[PDB]
Each structure stands twice: as C-alpha cells, then as structure tokens.
C-alpha cells in the first residue's frame, strides 16, 4: 500500500504538525525539537487538538492531509488541513483575535462545509473538559475528497543557491547564488491568500480572501465541462498532480483516469484582475502507457509523480516519472516523459529509461532542492538529482575531477553521509526525509513518540577527509538561510560526527570547528578581515544569531571550554545591544513629542503620555545592573591572569578584548549612555518631581560603579589602535578569526599575548 506522503508536514518554523490516528479524543498533534542539556535533544510534549466540522458552535472525522503554507516565500504560519469528508479547515498559529501569541497556540479563520467567518481561538484537548465527541470514521471516498492540495505564492522573489565547486586555483570552495524569479501562478498583494484543491470527482475549488475584508469567497468548477452531468460525476482520478509551468497563470493538471486508461493532461488559466478572479480550463493531450519493456517483461504503473520544474533547468518541461515494476524481479523501471509543443517544418518525447535494483514504496519531492527520493523496500534511500539523475551519495566517486570546476558539491549527502538501517516500511506509519537530507523522520506503530535517524560515515578514522567534510556541511546551512529554514536537523548530524572525532583525539576535533565555520563567511561573501565599514553590517546581521548558535551546540560537550562561552557573551552582548540602543532611538523621538504637544495640558491623552515617558526608563535599571556586573568579570580576570599566565582554563579573556566590533560596540553603548545622560540633564522632568527617581537613579548607578567608565572607555580604545598597527607589521587574516571565534592567540604571535 502507498504510504502517507502528506500525513506530516515540517513547517518552516520548526513546528511538526502530523496526523493522529490512535488517540480517541484528538486527530492532530503539534510538537517541535528542544534541547535537553545543551548536548542532547528531545521532541516537545505533543499538543493534541480535535478537529470536527462543527467547531463553529458532535462527531469528528479523520485527517486526510496536512499542508503547511511553507511554499516559496510564504510566512509558513497559516496551516490548512483537509479532512476525509472534504472539509478544508484553516488554522492560523502565532496570532490571537486580541493580541499576538507564540507559535504553539492555534486560532481559526473560517470553516468550509458554503463558507462563513467565525474567529475562535482553539484550546488543547487535555486542558479542555471531557466532551461528547467520538471518532467517527468516514470510510467513504466522496466526490469532494481532495486528492492534491496546492498553495499559491505572492509576487515576492526568492534568492537561493544552486551548487558550489572547488576552486583549485585558490584551493578553496566557491559558491554562486542565482535569484529565482516566480514561476507558475502567483496571487496579487491585494488578495490576502489563495489556494487550490482538486477533488476526486474532478470538481475544483479556489478559496481566496480579500485583504480589505473578512468575508471569504469560493469559486468551483469541474474538469469535464461536458453538456451531460452523466459524465461530469464520473472522473474518478487515481492521481491528480498539479505542477505549475512557466506559462503565465497556468497549472498542468496531470491526471490519470482509470475510466479511459489514459494519462490525460489539462491546462488551467486564471485572470487575477476588486473583481473575483476568473477560472478557465482547456483540454490538451492524452496518452496511453507502455505495456512491456524491451526484453519482454510486462509493466505495471505503481505511481505517477511529476516534478515541479522551474525555468532554470535546460529543458523546463516537467518530468512525468511513470514508475513501473517488472513482476517477480527486483528491478524497477522509471520511464521519463516530457511535454513539448508540436513543431512544424502537443507531444510527449521519451528521453531515456532508468533501471533501479529495488522496489520503490514511496516518492517525495524535496522543496527548493530538486531532489527525488526513492524510499526502497530495504530502507535505503537513493536521492537522484533533477539535473542529471546521478546518485548524490556516489557522485564524488564517479565525478570527472579534471576540469575548470572540480568537486561539485550540493549537499552534505554528497560527502558520503548515508543513513543507517531504517525500520522496515511495513512497521512504519509514515516517513519523511528531513529538509536538509541529513536525517529521516520515522513514526512507529508501537512508539508513542516520533523517532529520528541521523547520517553516519564509515571511514571516520581517515584524517585527510576533514577538509572536504567541513566544507560540505558549510554549504548545507547556506541554502537553509536563503530558504528561511530552521535547519535543526543539520545541527544534530554535525554534532554526532564531531563527538566521534573527540572520542579518539580531542585536539583534532577543535580544528574541525574552525575550518567548518570559516567556509560560511566565504560562501556568504562576508569577510571578518574586511575594513571596519563592513563590520557594522555584521553586528546587525541575522546570521550571527544562528552561526554563533552552531558552536553553542557543537561545543557543548567540551566542559570548561571557552568556544561556547565566547559565542554566548557576544550573543548576549547583542541582546545587551538591543536594550540600550533599542530604546535610545525610541527615547530620542520622545524629545520632539514634548515640544509640539505642549499646547494641550488638560487633555486625557497627555497624562498617559507623560506617565509612559518616565515609566520606560525605570525598566532599564535591571538591565544596567547586569551591564555593570559584566564588565567587572572581565576586569577581575585581568588581576588573576597576571599571577599565572600559563593557565589555559582562563583563555577566554583574550578573545573578548580581541574582538574588533565589540570594542566599538561598547564604545557606542558608552557614547549613547553619555548622550542619554546629557539629554536627560539637558531635558529633565519638571512637571512631577516624584517621577525624577528613575532619571536620578540612572545618573547614580553610573557614578557609583566600582570602576569608572571613562577609564574603562580608554582601555578598549587603545587596544584597537595597537591591534591595527600590528596588521600592517605583518599581513594575516587568521588573527581576525582567532580574536573573534577561537578566543586564542596563535603560537606564532606569542609575543602579542604578553602585551595584554
């Protein structure tokens, strides 16, 4: 039997919403990955919910498919689930009718049965009282049973990367990113969202919402637009795969109706332009399937998966991969067809045939990766690339090394990281390869919790392969950030390999981290050895919230080590940065509001405005206590290090001062602190003396600090000048990495350490 290709959906924000078929009080579950003790990981507690057609005011039905709106560049928060009865239930997470909420709390938009608006925040089943709802099983495949659900993207563009190659001239890996223009059908901004669903009887649906209204509208048609309803209700489509094509506002509805035993093709057209969009349909082509192979073995169509192909590839015609299995033979044939117009001097042109040695039980297409996954019977997975259908795990062995571009790598799977012995599909409810292909999710019958399997490498004792592996995992994150993926799956896989390295040689594992994170900067065209102008851009960059988090997890096992400590203090300084400068801009605008709003004193709006002015500065006081408490720790270590310079356990103090933007960042914090105090002194509170306590306390805490800020200000300023002249004395770029990440000084610069 075919597996649950759409039973589970990994939302782009990490929420794992999957169908539930065992609990008698719930049909859907929500969970996510969390860290146990910084080293290990565990799934979050399942948040069970119950979905029935009568939430608007009682038996609930099973869930057919779950589709997170993670397609293209969509935010990925609006989850629309279609049940077995055909009702499309839309749930929005991260929002409440009155306020904003976290990502684990759900909310309804509208229910379909006729469509009506009813906003209501859902509640978990466990917290809710025992209700009179029983699991009624809709074991009937209705005319309205949705076969395939597809989302509609907006007019925004997505920028991703295609592949990277090893530049032997510079002995470094180089990657190029190509912008991907939108292709297929996209909804305009004035429409809040749109979606399309194909029902098993051929009836089509088009839900959409106007951005300026709350009422929802639905437009429905039927594929077979014949004059007789006798054939209208006959199109029982076995497979209905919708692949958008480069044709404007066109979707190729590739259907296989067993009534006529032909793979019929269709074309759907929509005119966006507030009038309702118009829907049109036009029949195109129909072909019959091949009965036999070349040698005389008959074939059976197991699956019909057509790839969503953009205009980037050489031939944009979608690949209709009609799978065939030779009976009583381990072989499995995948014939490939392409749809092309008929040219004068449409039609399906056959390119070639590909033979696989094991039977296939599931096919899943990766998103923004162009990878077809063949989940064979024995559990092994062979992901064939869309470009050449060359096996990714064995591409390096068979790659033609000679050429301008060598060692073409697209994913960590190219290095050789193969999954272990996965559980057999008969015991498995559903599988899904993780977005980065680093691991596979397996749900088990007797396991109440989801499992997880990571990739392993057999030749971990060979030290010469560390250069390639670090670069391969470096590019894995490059695609993830461009697609706004959490990439929590990739983080787990990297740590396991590092842990096995550290068990034999602890010294070797430390260098693996340094080389791995260095390639990230080269891939993203960001240089820590650049002039100071780019350095300001680095601090505000989102990646440091994640790339620094990498060593926060990859260095957790190393007790009493400063690799994670160096990243955390810089990361927390960013939080410290958001505290003062986050409100320094806000406080500056409050100065102008005082003068222009001084003509109405008795109004009931100024009194709340006046109260809020002096309340905001009060909340900064607890932050300032940790701000002073932080600078004392580094000054305390100065006295300790002088007596015993040979103590390696206190090498964190070197990196903190060595960081180039941190010295400027603290100076900027000290600059705005002076500006704020000068402004407060220049513009004090006079109407209410009682409110001056917060303003006065701000002056007192600075003066009462055990160490004067002015003396400490000159401390970091002098370090910057001395560390710049040393660069001119001898050119070196590794010292920039050493002062920022390694938190150490190379032995070749041992004289520099004595100066501190």
């Amino acid at each position: 039997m075919m597996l649950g290709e759409h039973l589970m959906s990994w939302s782009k924000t990490g929420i794992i919403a999957y169908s539930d078929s065992q609990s008698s009080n719930a049909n859907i579950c929500l969970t996510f990955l969390e860290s146990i003790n910084g080293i290990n990981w565990r799934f979050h507690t399942p948040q069970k919910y119950v979905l029935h057609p009568q939430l608007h005011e009682q038996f609930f039905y099973n869930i057919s498919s779950i589709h997170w709106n993670n397609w293209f560049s969509l935010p990925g928060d609006m989850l629309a689930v279609c049940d077995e009865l055909g009702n499309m239930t839309m749930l929005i997470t991260g929002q409440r009718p009155d306020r904003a909420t976290t990502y684990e709390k759900l909310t309804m938009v509208f229910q379909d049965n006729k469509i009506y608006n009813h906003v209501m925040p859902l509640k978990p089943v466990d917290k809710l009282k025992p209700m009179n709802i029983e699991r009624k099983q809709t074991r009937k495949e209705y005319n309205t049973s949705i076969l395939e659900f597809r989302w509609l993207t907006s007019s925004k563009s997505v920028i991703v990367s295609q592949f990277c190659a090893f530049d032997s001239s510079s002995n470094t890996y180089r990657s190029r990113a190509q912008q991907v223009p939108p292709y297929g059908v996209y909804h305009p901004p004035f429409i809040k969202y749109a979606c399309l669903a194909i029902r098993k009887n051929g009836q089509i649906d088009f839900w959409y919402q106007f951005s300026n209204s709350k009422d929802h509208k639905k437009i429905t048609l039927q594929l077979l637009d014949t004059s007789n309803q006798r054939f209208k209700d006959l199109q029982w489509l076995e497979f209905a795969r919708i692949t958008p094509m480069n044709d404007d506002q066109c979707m190729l509805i590739t259907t296989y109706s067993k009534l006529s035993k032909n793979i019929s093709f269709y074309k759907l057209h929509v005119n966006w332009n507030l009038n309702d969009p118009s829907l049109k349909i036009q029949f195109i082509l129909s072909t019959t399937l091949d009965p036999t192979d070349d040698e005389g073995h008959v074939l059976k169509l197991e699956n019909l998966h057509v790839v969503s192909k953009s205009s980037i590839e050489k031939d944009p015609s979608p690949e209709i991969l009609v799978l065939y299995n030779v009976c009583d033979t381990s072989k499995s044939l995948v014939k490939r067809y392409r749809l092309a117009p008929t040219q004068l001097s449409y039609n399906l042109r056959r390119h070639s045939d590909i033979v696989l040695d094991k039977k296939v039980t599931l096919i899943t297409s990766e998103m923004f990766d162009a990878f077809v996954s063949f989940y064979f019977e024995d559990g092994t997975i062979e992901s064939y690339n869309q470009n050449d259908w060359k096996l990714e795990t064995e591409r390096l062995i068979s790659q033609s090394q000679l050429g301008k571009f060598k060692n073409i790598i697209a994913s960590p799977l190219s290095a050789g990281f193969n999954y272990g012995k996965l559980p057999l599909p008969p015991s498995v409810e559903w599988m899904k390869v993780s977005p980065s292909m680093c691991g596979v999710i397996v749900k088990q019958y007797n396991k109440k919790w989801p499992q997880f399997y990571a990739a392993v490498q057999k030749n971990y004792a060979d030290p010469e392969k560390d250069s390639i592996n670090a670069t391969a995992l470096a590019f894995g994150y490059v695609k993830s950030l461009h697609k706004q993926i959490s990439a929590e799956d990739l983080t787990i896989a990297a740590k396991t390999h590092i842990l096995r390295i550290s068990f034999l040689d602890r010294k070797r594992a430390k260098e693996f981290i340094t080389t791995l994170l260095k390639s990230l900067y080269s891939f993203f065209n960001i240089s820590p050895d650049a002039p100071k102008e780019i350095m300001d851009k680095i601090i505000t960059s989102r990646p440091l919230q994640k790339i620094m988090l990498l060593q926060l997890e990859l260095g957790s096992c190393f007790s009493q080590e400063n690799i994670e400590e160096m990243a955390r203090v810089i990361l927390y300084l960013k939080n410290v940065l958001f505290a003062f400068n986050g409100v320094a801009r806000n406080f500056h605008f409050a100065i102008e509001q005082i003068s222009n709003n001084s003509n109405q004193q008795q109004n009931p709006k100024l009194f709340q405005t006046i109260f809020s002015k002096q309340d905001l500065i009060h909340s900064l006081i607890p932050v300032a206590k940790w701000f002073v408490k932080f600078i004392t720790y580094l000054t305390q270590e100065i006295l300790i290090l002088i007596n015993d310079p040979t103590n390696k356990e206190y090498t964190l103090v070197h990196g903190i001062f060595g960081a180039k933007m941190s010295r400027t960042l603290i100076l900027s914090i000290l600059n705005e602190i002076k500006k704020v105090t000068q402004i407060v002194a220049k513009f004090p509170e006079t109407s209410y003396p009682i409110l001056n306590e917060s303003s006065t306390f701000l002056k007192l805490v600075l003066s009462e600090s055990p160490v004067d800020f002015e003396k400490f200000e000159t401390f970091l300023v002098d370090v910057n000048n001395k560390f710049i002249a040393l660069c001119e004395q001898q050119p070196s770029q590794e010292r920039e990495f050493s002062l920022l990440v390694k938190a150490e000084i190379p032995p070749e610069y041992a004289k520099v350490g004595d100066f501190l």
Partner: protein
C-alpha cells in the same frame, strides 16, 4: 448449508459463463464435484443423471432470474449487455446439447424441472417486458422447449402442456428436423446436406461488395442470408458451422491462401445478428488468437520469396495487402469491445516472441502516433535508416499530392508495417498544416485524400480514425473559425463520404468507421456537420453495438429530459460512488441490495476504485459493523463458527476474480508455497497478499512488528490458501 450451496453455485456458474469455459468437456464433472468440494466432510451420494440435469436446469433458471431482476436497481444507462447475450446464447444453445448427449430422454424430468420454478421469475420477466413495451412476448422457456423438439427429445404434445391455457401452438408449423434449409434464388427451401462444401463454394463466389449495401434479405448468396437469419439456426448444426470455420481457417494459414482469408475476416468483423458473439461462446478465444497472431507475426518471412515480375503480382499484392490489413481489424474489435488482451496470450504461449512482436506494441499505441517517422524501431541507434526515412516521406508526399499517381516501385520497396505508420504521419501533417493555415488549397487536397482509399493503401486508415478524437477534442475546446472548420469537415468528408469506392474497399471503409465511431459521435455533436453524423449513424445502424445507449444513436428528435451516457459505467451526484459502495458494504457484510451476482457492474467498479482501496475500505470496516451489530442469520452471539461461514462468502468471491482456468489453480498453490505465474496476474489479490506476507516476515527477523500483528495477517493468507487447495478450479 443450502443457502451456502446455492450462493456458491450461482457465483460459480456466473464466473464459468464469463470465462468462456462452456465448451470445456469438464463442465459436468466440475458441476458434479461442486457439492463434494463445498462440504469438507465426505459426501458419498450417487447422484443420478436426471438429478444433475435437473439441478443444472433450476440453477440456470434462477441465475437468469436474478440476473434480469437485479437490473432495475442499476443506473438506467449503465448499459452492459455482453453477459446478457452470453446467458441467452448459453441457455438456448448449450443446455439443449447438454441434455441431448447427457440425458436419457425422459419427458417427466423436464416437466418436473420446469414445474418446480417459482412464479416470481415469471412475474418479473413479464413486468420487465411490459415496462419495455397484446404483442407477442415470448419467454426463454419457449425457446428451450423448441430446441428440444428439433432434436427428437420430446414429442410435439409436450409444448402444449406448458403453453397458456388459452393459446396453443400448431404442431405442424414447428420445425422438427435438424437439417439445414436455405431459401434459394427461386424461393425453394433447399437442403444443405454438406456444411463445409457450402461455405467454401459460397466463399469462392462471394462478392465483397455485397456486405453492407445488400440491406435486403433476397440476396442470391445463401451464406449471406444465414448471417441476417442467424437467430433461427438448429441447435446441433451451429456447432458444426462454428467448427467448419476453424478447420477451414487454419488450413488457409498453412497454404497461404490470401483470397479466402480476407473474405472470412470481413464476415466476422461486422457481427450481423450477433454472429461474432456466438463464435467466442463456443471455441476458446485463446486458440483463435494464437493462429491469428501467428499469421501477423510470421508474415515477415513470406515477402522474401516473392518477386514482383508477373501480371498476377498486382492481383497478388492487393490480395496480400487485404489479407494482412483485415486480420488487424479482427484483433482490434476483439480487444476493444470483447475484453480480450493481446499481452496475455503471448505470456501463455512461449512460442511467441514478445520482444520481436510487432502486433503487441501496435495495439497498445493504437490511438497515438509518433511525431517522427522511423523505418525500424529496434535499431534507433543507427543513422543509416533515418537518412532514407525522410526520403520516404518526401517521396510519398510528392507522388500523391503533386504527381497524382502512385508508382509501382514505391509499393514494392515498402512493407505493410511502414505503411501502417506512414499514412497517419502524412495525414496528420496535412491536417495540422490546414488548421494552422499553412495549407490553403482544399480542392487539390480533396482529390489527394482520395488516393488513401485504394486497396493497397487500405491498412493506413486504421490509425487515422483513432487520432481524430484527440485532434477533435483539442479542436472542440480551441477557437477555430468556421471557414477553417468547414474546411476541416471538407477534408474529413472525403474519407467519410467517398464519391466512388472500389469493389474491395467499400466494405473495408465501413468496417474501419465502425471501430471507433462512438467517441467520434460524442465529440461531433458538441458543435456540412449533419452529413458526418448522418454517415456515422448510418454505419452504426448496420449491426447492433454492445453497451451503448440506444437513445444516443437516435437522438435526432427524442428529448426524454435525461442526459445521455456514452460510457459503460456512469455515476451521478444523486447516486455517488459512496452510496453504491455503502450499498456494497451492506452487501459485502449483510448481503443486502441487489448489485451482487452482476459481475458486469462489479468488475468495472473494482477497477474504478482499484483492488487496493476496494479491499482496504471493506476489510477494516467489517470490524466496526461486526463489533456492534453481530453476525446476521443467528439470534445468539455465541461461537465463531457462525462468523466463519460469513468470512467464506467474501474470500470465495475473491478467488474467482483471480483464478480463471483449470490448470491455473495448480500453479498458484506453488506461488504461495515459496516468475511466469505472477506475470499474468499483476492486479490479482493473491499477488498483493503474498507480497505483504514476505515483507512483514522480514520485519519479524528484525523485530519492528509485534508478534500479535504478524499472526493476524497470516490468518487471512492461510485462509485464502486453504480454500484454494481444497477446491478444484
């Protein structure tokens, strides 16, 4: 026990009638052994011959009763009549012979058999006939007795016993002798003492023009009169006539007699008065297929020993071309309407080269034509033939569209197989060019398409009509101006309504238009238009068409306020797939509704839902009904033996849908106990059950499945084997 016996026997007869196994001399043996096989315990009763024939009589009558009385619950247009005609043919033809050489000629036993029937069958038959329509309304019982009279089984005084008390039948008028009588040219009923000589003598003097234009029955040819009067042939004599064709046809293949091969195929294709259906009812279609596909495959060696240097060559080449071209049309008609597969026969007979079979891959790609022209398909890796492949295209286009004549050199140098694909290529190029606007001159083309109707080029029309609907379906949705549209009809009408036809091409042209007429009519009506439908309806009325709504053919003025259904199986929203299968669940579990014993409406339903979803949605849904309601027919919820027989109903039905012949069963037992076996049964349940049995056993070694779950699945599997081994198929 009796209910189990009757259900098993009715399904067994239905399956065996569908499977064309009536001609098997093991029918009576299997029918007698049914009673012993059903009951596991020994049942050693000496059943006398009269008992067997009586049991057959009431079984057949009750089966026909259920078959005709279950039809009102079907959709009014879900029309499938092959099995209805098959029941009629069996009951009127074989059962009289079964009595003739199986009975002891006892008049009493027939009276007991036909007096023990319930009046419900008679009431239902009369009600259905009255609703369809005093006018003479004869039942199937009258035809049964009439056949027995001709065989000297019963005296003429027996028919009056069962006649209505107010109406008798004159004894003298009823025929009593089994001798063939034919109306000669002078009106005297001549006695055909010898059958084989009559066929060959008429066949030699037969005219191919007399096929469709001879609407009147007063034709000088005796054999042609028989086809239009096929319903009144004697019981025992028609077996000789069917066997006469087989021996003659096989001898014509051995001697390579091209004249009589082409003529024979023309008679069988058109199926006047259900002539072709009776042929398949007797002789097994497998043996007919084997010899027929041998000719179309072994004809390659026959063209390397003939030299075109005689004035009889053009006579021979036309004779060769028509013999080969007609033999293709016989296969397509059998595959499409009669539900036979060309792939299956190759697997069963090892002497057929599957990889080198041109017929096998031709049928499966019949409605689709390649955009590129290849002289040979197995050697696409070579470029030498592709150089002259384009030469052939330009050589034929210039000679036929500009020169206006077909040179004899072109015909001699090319084979029939290349012609079968060359003609669709050229017509597609010309028609596409006309539609776009590349070709603007029609009159030269109208004459140009006339050259496609010559006897030499007749085989090229087979693929021309199939592509038309795919061409027309795009045309129907696309916006085409009437000036172009009227041109399309003008070019099309040349093939549809020729000005003149040769004496060997007139019957062929009608025959090809008859294969793929039905989908063409549906597309055309969606829009010089009328003549095409008028021609299409004319060729559709020459003989009856199976599984077609009669209202569609004659919808010129009838408006019944009900939309027409062109397909065999039709579905509405008022009666969706849910309601019928929910009624199937009521029948799969409680044997309710009335759609059972109708393998016409059920076999197609299974395919429309696939065996996987069909079995998945019923096996696990049974538990919900069983856990709440209980086993029907028992007032006590004690024991599992009562539920055991209910499970036997479901598993016995699935066995017949998988096993189709006698020796096949002996080979499926070896498939379970563990290549060629599962090839023929790709979609069988047995494959699905066995493939999961081995797969989950692998997980048992690896221990990802609980032992209880594995034990449950094998319980279904061993039950399937247990009934398979204890019952003879």
């Amino acid at each position: 026990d009796m209910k189990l016996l009757r259900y098993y026997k009715n399904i067994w007869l239905n399956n065996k009638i569908i499977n064309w196994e009536i001609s098997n001399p093991d029918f009576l043996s299997k029918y007698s052994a049914i009673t012993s096989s059903i009951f596991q315990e020994s049942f050693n009763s000496v059943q006398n011959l009269d008992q067997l024939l009586t049991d057959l009589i009431e079984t057949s009558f009750t089966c026909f009763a259920q078959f005709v009385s279950n039809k009102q619950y079907h959709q009014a247009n879900s029309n499938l009549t092959l099995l209805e005609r098959k029941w009629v043919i069996f009951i009127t033809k074989h059962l009289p012979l079964l009595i003739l050489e199986n009975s002891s000629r006892s008049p009493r036993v027939v009276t007991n058999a036909l007096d023990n029937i319930d009046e419900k069958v008679v009431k239902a038959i009369r009600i259905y006939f009255t609703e369809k329509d005093p006018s003479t309304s004869l039942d199937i019982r009258h035809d049964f007795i009439k056949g027995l009279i001709m065989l000297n089984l019963q005296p003429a005084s027996v028919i009056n016993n069962y006649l209505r008390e107010d109406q008798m039948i004159d004894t003298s008028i009823l025929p009593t002798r089994d001798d063939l009588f034919v109306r000669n040219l002078q009106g005297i009923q001549e006695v055909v003492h010898n059958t084989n000589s009559f066929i060959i003598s008429s066949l030699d003097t037969l005219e191919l023009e007399s096929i469709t234009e001879s609407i009147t029955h007063d034709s000088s040819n005796g054999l042609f009169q028989v086809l239009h009067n096929f319903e009144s042939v004697a019981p025992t004599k028609q077996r000789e006539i069917v066997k006469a064709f087989l021996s003659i046809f096989e001898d014509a293949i051995k001697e390579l007699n091209y004249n009589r091969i082409a003529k024979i195929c023309a008679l069988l294709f058109f199926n006047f008065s259900h002539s072709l259906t009776t042929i398949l009812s007797f002789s097994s279609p497998a043996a007919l297929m084997k010899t027929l596909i041998k000719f179309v495959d072994l004809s390659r060696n026959g063209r390397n020993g003939s030299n075109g240097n005689d004035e009889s060559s053009e006579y021979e080449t036309i004779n060769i071309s028509l013999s080969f071209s007609w033999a293709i049309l016989l296969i397509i008609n059998l595959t499409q309407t009669y539900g036979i597969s060309v792939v299956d026969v190759a697997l069963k007979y090892p002497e057929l080269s599957i990889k080198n079979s041109f017929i096998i891959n031709f049928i499966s790609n019949l409605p689709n034509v390649s955009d590129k022209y290849y002289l040979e398909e197995s050697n696409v890796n070579d470029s030498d033939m592709l150089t002259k492949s384009h030469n052939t295209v330009q050589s034929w286009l210039c000679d036929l569209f500009v020169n206006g004549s077909i040179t004899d050199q072109l015909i001699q140098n090319i084979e029939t197989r290349q012609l079968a694909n060359l003609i669709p290529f050229i017509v597609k190029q010309v028609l596409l060019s006309v539609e776009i606007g590349v070709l603007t001159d029609i009159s030269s083309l109208i004459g140009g398409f006339e050259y496609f109707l010559q006897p030499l080029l007749l085989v090229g029309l087979i693929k021309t009509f199939y592509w038309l609907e795919q061409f027309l379906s795009c045309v129907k949705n696309d916006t085409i101006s009437e000036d172009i549209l009227q041109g399309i009809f003008n070019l099309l009408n040349t093939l549809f309504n020729p000005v003149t036809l040769n004496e060997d091409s007139k019957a062929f042209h009608t025959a090809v238009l008859r294969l793929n007429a039905i989908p063409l009519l549906k597309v055309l009506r969606k829009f010089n238009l009328e003549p095409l439908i008028a021609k299409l309806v004319a060729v559709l009325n020459v003989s009856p068409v199976y599984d077609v709504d009669p209202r569609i053919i004659n919808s010129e003025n009838d408006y019944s306020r009900k939309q027409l259904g062109y397909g065999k199986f039709l579905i509405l929203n008022e009666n969706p797939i849910n309601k019928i299968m929910t009624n199937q669940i009521n029948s799969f579990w409680s044997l309710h509704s009335s759609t059972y014993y109708n393998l016409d409406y059920l076999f197609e339903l299974i395919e429309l839902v696939t065996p996987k979803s069909f079995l998945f949605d019923v096996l696990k849904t049974l538990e919900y009904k069983l856990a709440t309601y209980g086993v029907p027919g028992s007032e006590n919820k004690r024991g599992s033996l009562d539920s055991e027989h209910v499970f036997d109903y479901f598993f016995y039905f699935l066995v017949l849908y998988d096993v189709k012949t006698a020796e096949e069963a002996s080979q499926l037992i070896e498939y379970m106990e563990n290549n060629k076996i599962s090839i023929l049964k790709r979609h069988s349940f047995a494959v699905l059950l066995h493939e999961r049995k081995l797969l989950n056993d692998l997980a048992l070694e690896n221990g990802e499945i609980t032992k209880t779950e594995n034990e449950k699945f094998i319980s279904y599997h061993d039950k399937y084997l247990c009934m398979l081994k204890t019952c003879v198929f």
